[PDB]
Amino acid sequence: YNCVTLHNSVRMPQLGLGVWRAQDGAETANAVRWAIEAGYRHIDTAYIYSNERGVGQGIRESGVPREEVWVTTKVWNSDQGYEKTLAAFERSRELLGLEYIDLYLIHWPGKKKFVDTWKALEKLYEEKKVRAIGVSNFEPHHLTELFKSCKIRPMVNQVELHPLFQQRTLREFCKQHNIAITAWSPLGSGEEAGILKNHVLGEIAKKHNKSPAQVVIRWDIQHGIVTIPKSTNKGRIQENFNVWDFKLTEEEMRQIDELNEDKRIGADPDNFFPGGE
Numbered sequence: 001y002n003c004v005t006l007h008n009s010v011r012m013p014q015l016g017l018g019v020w021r022a023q024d025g026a027e028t029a030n031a032v033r034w035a036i037e038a039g040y041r042h043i044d045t046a047y048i049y050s051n052e053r054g055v056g057q058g059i060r061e062s063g064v065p066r067e068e069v070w071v072t073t074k075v076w077n078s079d080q081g082y083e084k085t086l087a088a089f090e091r092s093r094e095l096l097g098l099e100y101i102d103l104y105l106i107h108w109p110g111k112k113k114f115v116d117t118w119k120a121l122e123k124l125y126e127e128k129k130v131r132a133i134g135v136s137n138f139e140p141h142h143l144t145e146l147f148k149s150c151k152i153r154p155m156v157n158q159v160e161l162h163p164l165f166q167q168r169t170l171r172e173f174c175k176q177h178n179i180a181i182t183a184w185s186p187l188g189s190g191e192e193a194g195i196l197k198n199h200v201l202g203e204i205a206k207k208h209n210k211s212p213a214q215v216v217i218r219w220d221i222q223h224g225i226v227t228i229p230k231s232t233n234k235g236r237i238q239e240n241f242n243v244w245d246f247k248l249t250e251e252e253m254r255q256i257d258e259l260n261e262d263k264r265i266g267a268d269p270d271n272f273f274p275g276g277e
């Protein structure tokens with residue numbers, strides 16, 4: 001299926017499972033296995049989700065060869081700093097049961113330690129322990145600041161992105177510095193869900209005989225954004241993957257784009273750094 005190319009030529013599958021909010025053990029292992037069974041080849045996790053064991057279990061259970069799957073995980077705020085970050089990588093690696101990790105990200109920028117943390121990601125990349133390195137919830141100013149002090153520039157930035165918060169500024173900033181955007185959103189585990197409940201998505205979903213969530217995912221795909229919808233439900237997990245047998249029209253894309261309100265719904269990167277030390 002579709003892949004997005006990072007600035008080091010590694011190809012990152014465009015659709016993945018978010019396991020954010022999945023309880024460890026069975027819940028995750030099932031979610032991951034079900035995803036892989038359905039065809040997903042990309043799992044997105046994070047130390048702080050406390051479910052790296054379960055992810056590893058799901059992957060081993062699926063029976064799919066390691067190199068055919070992409071695994072992303074992330075260094076938590078409290079493990080920022082060169083040596084601390086290096087150590088959190090190993091704790092994550094051991095917990096996933098993996099010899100290498102495909103992508104490792106800084107989970108939140110913070111203020112004082114992210115340049116230092118990035119130096120550790122560069123090391124892991126030189127040591128061939130990760131295939132790609134990037135950041136999450138970084139804003140252009142963070143990225144501009146990081147650019148002053150790095151040898152390898154970030155390859156991914158995973159941020160809140162959905163039809164009411166379309167991140168146009170950052171998208172252009174990332175187009176211009178060769179960075180792939182990954183979209184997360186406060187959906188899948190059943191939050192307020194205003195994002196999905198509007199006439200534009202409704203009628204596009206109805207026209208194609210799909211759900212509004214399937215539409216948003218497809219909209220992500222056709223904008224070349226990487227998308228990691230989270231769910232622990234076997235059916236929803238399957239539904240989120242059934243997005244390859246239809247195309248949104250150029251007009252349908254402008255219509256969804258028109259929904260932009262720059263309405264952030266999750267936490268603000270400039271003022272959010274729980275666990276910071």
Ligand SMILES: N[C@@H](CCC(=O)O)C(=O)O
Nearest residue numbers: 020046048107136137184
């Ligand atoms: N994947 C979520 C994790 C939430 C958290 O930071 O605990 C995010 O970065 O938005």
